[PDB]
Design a protein around this ligand. Structure first.
Ligand code: JHS
Length: 284
């Protein structure tokens, strides 16, 4: 079926939970043996969210190459994304090592450091220009260059230096700051505006390594971001945009990381975002 009318048909019939459970039943199951090794317990935020072995990002290190991060490679859309958990106190150096080694231009953050009164990820970037951060375990230096605070999101320019080689690179930090502590946003308008700002920066384009996207577990909000982006790109590429099947795209992405889209409300919000986004692209 088309999307917008499949949408109204699920709303009127109140069957979002049944649709979402079908997705959960059909999703791929692949091994994640490296994630479950005892030496990696303090590298995982949640025991039930792990990268598959076949798609995990490897650190360029011979001691321990493990990080909780996955490469999502979308062949028809010609887009790739790295989806990862919010960094932990003992993985902030690994996180920036990955950004460096994978040649990423942008980092997309969809959570606040504290939500619901608890810590959802480490404070992994510097908050003042004159107070830089040094990660001694991976030999990197990170400096805040500029910060632009808007009503729904903040964009930061960061300098990452590889202290071994003295090479430097500019990294863009895109921080969506207004996702509610409970539920999903009422309108997708600010989320779509944010997606378009990431696109306009070049961070999603083939001349760079894959964008790094995270929330707390790296599967819920993070899944919504890449699902919406890929669906809108396919609607632009194909002769028949009504052929794009958001459930099929989501199942393809779940071949590369488990659990993408965590609730039926996140599934409905993804439909809403793609539907509204397709009107703004055109031609409008
Ligand atoms: C190489 C280059 O063009 N550097 C430009 C600046 C920069 C530095 C590092 C990260 C991002 C931006 C831009 C504004 O700050 C001053 C330097």
């Amino acid at each position: 079926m088309e999307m917008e009318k499949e949408f109204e048909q699920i709303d009127k019939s109140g069957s979002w939970a049944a649709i979402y459970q079908d997705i959960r039943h059909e999703a791929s199951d692949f091994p994640s043996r490296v994630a479950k090794l005892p030496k990696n317990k303090n590298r995982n935020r949640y025991r039930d969210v792990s990268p598959f072995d076949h798609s995990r990002i490897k650190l360029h290190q011979e001691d321990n190459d493990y990080i909780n991060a996955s490469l999502i490679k979308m062949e028809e859309a010609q887009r790739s994304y790295i989806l990862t958990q919010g960094p932990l106190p003992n993985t902030v150096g690994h996180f920036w090592e990955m950004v460096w080694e994978q040649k990423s231009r942008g980092v997309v953050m969809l959570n606040r450091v504290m939500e619901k009164g608890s810590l959802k990820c480490a404070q992994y970037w510097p908050q003042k220009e004159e107070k830089e951060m040094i990660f001694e375990d991976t030999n990197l230096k990170l400096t805040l260059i500029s910060e632009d605070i808007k009503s729904y999101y903040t964009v930061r320019q960061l300098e990452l230096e590889n202290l071994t080689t003295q090479e430097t690179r500019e990294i863009l930090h895109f921080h969506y700051t207004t996702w509610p502590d409970f539920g999903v946003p009422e309108s997708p308008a600010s989320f779509l505006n944010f997606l378009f700002k990431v696109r306009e920066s070049g961070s999603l384009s083939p001349e760079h390594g894959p964008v790094v996207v995270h929330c707390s577990a790296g599967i819920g909000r993070s899944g919504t971001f890449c699902l919406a982006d890929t669906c809108l790109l396919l609607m632009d590429k194909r002769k028949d945009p009504s052929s794009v099947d958001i459930k099929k795209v989501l199942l393809e992405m779940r071949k590369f990381r488990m659990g993408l889209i965590q609730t039926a409300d996140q599934l409905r919000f993804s439909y809403l975002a793609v539907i509204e986004g397709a009107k703004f692209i055109m031609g409008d």
